[PDB]
Design a protein around this nucleic acid. Sequence first.
RNA 1: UAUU
Length: 713
Amino acid sequence: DGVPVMLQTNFFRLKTKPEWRIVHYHVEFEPSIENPRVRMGVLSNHANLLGSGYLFDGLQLFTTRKFEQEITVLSGKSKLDIEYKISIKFVGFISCAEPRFLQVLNLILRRSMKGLNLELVGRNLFDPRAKIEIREFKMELWPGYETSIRQHEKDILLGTEITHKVMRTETIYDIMRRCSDEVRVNVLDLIVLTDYNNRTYRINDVDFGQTPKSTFSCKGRDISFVEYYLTKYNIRIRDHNQPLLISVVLIPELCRVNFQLMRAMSSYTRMNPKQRTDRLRAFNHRLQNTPESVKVLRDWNMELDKNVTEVQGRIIGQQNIVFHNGKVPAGENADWQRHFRDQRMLTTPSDGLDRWAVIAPQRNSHELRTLLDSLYRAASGMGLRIRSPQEFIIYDDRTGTYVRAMDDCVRSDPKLILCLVPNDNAERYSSIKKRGYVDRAVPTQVVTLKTTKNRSLMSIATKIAIQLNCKLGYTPWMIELPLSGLMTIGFDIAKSTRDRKRAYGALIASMDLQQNSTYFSTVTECANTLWPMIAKALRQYQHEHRKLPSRIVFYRDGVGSLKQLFEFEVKDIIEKLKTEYARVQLSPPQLAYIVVTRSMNTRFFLNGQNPPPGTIVDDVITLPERYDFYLVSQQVRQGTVSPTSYNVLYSSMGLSPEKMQKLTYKMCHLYYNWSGTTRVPAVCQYAKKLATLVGTNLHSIPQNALEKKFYYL
RNA sequence: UAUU
Ligand SMILES: [Hg+2]
Ligand SMILES: [Hg+2]
Ligand SMILES: [Hg+2]
Ligand SMILES: [Hg+2]
Ligand SMILES: [Hg+2]
Ligand SMILES: [Hg+2]
Ligand SMILES: [Zn+2]
Ligand SMILES: [Zn+2]
Ligand SMILES: [Zn+2]
Ligand SMILES: [Zn+2]
Ligand SMILES: [Zn+2]
Ligand SMILES: [Zn+2]
Ligand SMILES: [Zn+2]
Ligand SMILES: [Zn+2]
């Protein structure tokens, strides 16, 4: 297996009495009461059990004290001094396996979090007082804490994580003032979010005949909107002339209406492990000093441990990266970029770069020649025979000029087309990719002008040569794979920039890497559309190997909703694998279905630092019902590691869990755009890359001639 | 769009 270690976490133990159980009763009153809240008060009258925290819904009762039998209390109610007889009938104990166990624990912990007086939303606690406003980006970022609870045979654990909820400063009242019928045309059909209650509404009309001074009727009381929002949310309405949004009746003053913004926010969110540990200990000490939360915690006779729990784990040994003539170890820092310097790629076309073209404008011939010299040198050092491409010098840097050059050049049937661009323009890049992959079938390479002027142009040209070798459909390196007839599938999905109502699903499939070591890639728009792609992959596999694969490892990017995706995806997959292998009158293959999730909620560290690549936590902090584990595969220079969560829904592989984990760590070594281990298995990162390319730039399905090439890299 |  690997080298075992002990790792710091972000969980604290909830210690209770050694013999500590939860008692559930059903409660009823001799004088019947049509209102449950009155019953709650009537039971609250009993102080013998009041000091102990108890959960009463008007019928179900959860408490700690176990009574002698079915027990009955009696007293006089506050209203009319009516003699009431409460019949508290014993139901039983909540088993450690019942989900009501964790539901009761969640309600208790939420009651405790209430003492901190933080806005509670789902499993998150926010501090709106501590909002970070940004008028530069017109957005407010609220810090907060994400919470989770885990059950183990040894105890009960409670974990926290830093979280940031972002929202837009722009309000619908501001949009209406910018327009000032046209306001109604601009506002109707939009979705707004109330800043006092995490609810969104579709505005269907705007009533100009009503104001915040108008009144509505609740369940019994009549009240104005100003009074309602001052008494229910302590929110003051300053503008009295504004109209009302009718969806419910909302106030516009109180209604609120990516990849570079992600960079800015990451600059504001990247955190050293020590800083995250400090903020976590601060939150713990805050909850510990608050007497309101401590009262709730102590009433149930359970104590937070101000000390962090640590887990047993193991670090996978370094894996061997194979090239033509030899193989190298990955290293303690799982990066091998230093190694292809004076090393040859695994699979190289004997033809080499026998026919390709280069399109560039007349102004940038000098930088183009520099780039081409670097490419020749680097690709020759890699084993890639590159010859002189076809010169395609255009005059203007416009998009139509590039498109026309491509269409005039394709007539010579080139293996590849490299295009030198002036700047970082998504428009011309998307148009180039669309003309290359969708309308025609030519793998292309784009180089930003700033790249040519880079001082370290030689290592850049080496990485570009690796990318080009992949674009041709050849293999730069390979892992040691002790399995026969294995097909690894990755699959992911992406939203579209042109239309948010469509999504693209990309599927990547290996072809018995110990022999063929190539990949097959399909995309389709969102009638389950994934099985056609799986069938295409199996057909290509049997057309290349004269046989179907014996084992299949399916990596799924998603996620709880496990039950839904388990049922639908896995059941249909198994039935249709039965069917497809029955077409060949064969038995269905060994199948492993794993859901890959980047769990930013659960973290763990080694000696207070980021764990090294290959670290694994199996079945301690993981979910009890699931057969799953955590893996750290990609080391991070800066920031905090987000471990990957691999959840094996179905497994008929006949492989030990350690073997499955080692195979997954191996498959994490095969993303050719990155000279090291990636955060996810390689096929999954390929699927994400292809789906993002289709949904962001291509907006259409690429031609089927590129099925065996890494054109999307 | 060398890479994310
Ligand atoms: Hg249990
Ligand atoms: Hg307008
Ligand atoms: Hg009311
Ligand atoms: Hg050409
Ligand atoms: Hg899909
Ligand atoms: Hg993925
Ligand atoms: Zn019950
Ligand atoms: Zn050779
Ligand atoms: Zn050739
Ligand atoms: Zn120069
Ligand atoms: Zn995904
Ligand atoms: Zn255990
Ligand atoms: Zn488009
Ligand atoms: Zn690329």
